[PDB]
């Protein structure tokens, strides 16, 4: 679902209730680290799901709504575009992302193209068994 405060609540409360937060005096340090990872990867899943409809995105709303600083938000978004190699135009000075990646049909086309690619890969695997 992606609600990060809900995700924190289920992990933190039930490990106090179950006597599992108590064990290490680093408990709050580890909780803070897990809190930041949940904030980063909830923002990541939010962008992956909603890039199915998003033309363009403001970065103030991402900062406030995921309760994060602008360096962390710029760092999250830039790494996501840079290392999955996404065709998204990021403006850091004007705090604005433009993409237009849509669509319902394009997803079915990519799924069919993956299915057809696994036809050619098997077609050429059968040849390398043969010879």
């Amino acid at each position: 679902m992606g609600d990060w405060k809900t995700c924190h609540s289920f992990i933190i409360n039930e490990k106090m209730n179950g006597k599992v937060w108590d064990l290490f005096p680093e408990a709050d340090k580890v909780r803070t680290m897990l809190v930041r990872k949940i904030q980063e990867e909830s923002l990541r899943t939010y962008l992956f799901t909603y890039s199915s409809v998003y033309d363009s995105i403001s970065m103030e709303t991402l900062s406030d709504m995921f309760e994060l600083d602008l360096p962390t938000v710029h760092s999250i978004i830039s790494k996501m575009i840079i290392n999955e190699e996404l065709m998204a135009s990021l403006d850091q000075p004007t705090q604005t992302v433009v993409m237009h990646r849509t669509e319902p049909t394009a997803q079915q086309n990519l799924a069919l193209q993956l299915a057809e690619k696994l036809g050619s890969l098997v077609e050429n695997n059968e040849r390398v068994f043969d010879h």
Binding site: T49, S52, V53, S56, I57, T61, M65, T96, P104
Partner: protein, 410 residues
Amino acid sequence: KLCDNLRMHLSQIQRHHNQSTAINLNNPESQSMHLETRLVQLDSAISMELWQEAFKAVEDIHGLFSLSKKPPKPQLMANYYNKVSTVFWKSGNALFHASTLHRLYHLSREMRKNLTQDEMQRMSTRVLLATLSIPITPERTDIARLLDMDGIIVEKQRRLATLLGLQAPPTRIGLINDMVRFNVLQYVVPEVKDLYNWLEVEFNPLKLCERVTKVLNWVREQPEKEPELQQYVPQLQSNTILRLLQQVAQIYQSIEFSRLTSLVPFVDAFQLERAIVDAARHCDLQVRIDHTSRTLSFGSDLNYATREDAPIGPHLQSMPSEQIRNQLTAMSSVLAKALEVIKPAHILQEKEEQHQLAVTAYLKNSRKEHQRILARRQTIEERKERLESLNIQREKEELEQREAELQKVR
């Protein structure tokens, strides 16, 4: 102990060693097993296993009640157990809540007819609790479950619903529709009944918030008002906003976010926009939420597929707009022109009178051929009987003939 006691109980029923349902031996054992499972389920236990043993016990008891004839006080206790079940299912599975609550209102209606129940105030709170609780079924967000095939989860949901005794799980619009046709709607409390009139038929999207908020706070006040009702208010409040947002998406093309916040008064601004953002993230409506001057667009006609539909069909009456879909342009172009010509056009009437004359010319010749065809067909029918049957012997005879021949050439 509950799991092994159930194995012992079913084994005892399967003995029949001077024991039968006519002395009601099953009933204290099932009553204990129901009370013990029900208390353990409320206090604390793992979710899965209590239900797995309880469903097997229900299948036996449903069998025994059908065989021995339907017993009114154990069915009334089963109704009381089903009220505990509806609350647990609102936590764990909305489809099972919808079937169990519909079954609870059906069985309690039959108990009122059979046994008389004059508890008018309690019946009124229980009917309002039923109408408000029943349609609230969200959509599936379990992405790994979809990949690993949702149909197996659906197989168990269908069989558990047939075991519950109400066939397949009820769908969102039909569940509202037949609950409205039930005469228990007449008995519904005024504030809740006119809340239904505001939520269903006088669904003006710029006045919904004016109406609902006062009633929503009233049902959230707890001293006599069923504790179940109070915990159903935030989901009812969200379901009200979801129904409103889909209507707004069909009436508005674009809206300022500042004005959009003003139209929906709520507990908090952040929780309100986060709720609109969450529905946008899931895609229970087509939207682009954010922009530099922070304005939101639903657009026209754009993605008029699953994302506008939410996901298979609107959650409200027929004020969804005329968006373009597959074949619709051709169908509307043909249908409008056909309706305009067919309804009053003299040239079409003249064509029909000429066509009717041609049909009568065919028919007046056809009666002559029907007389001749009777003699041809009676001759064919009698000799078709004999010729096809004489061959239908051969296609069997030749199997025996093949063996007899193959037994003469070895």
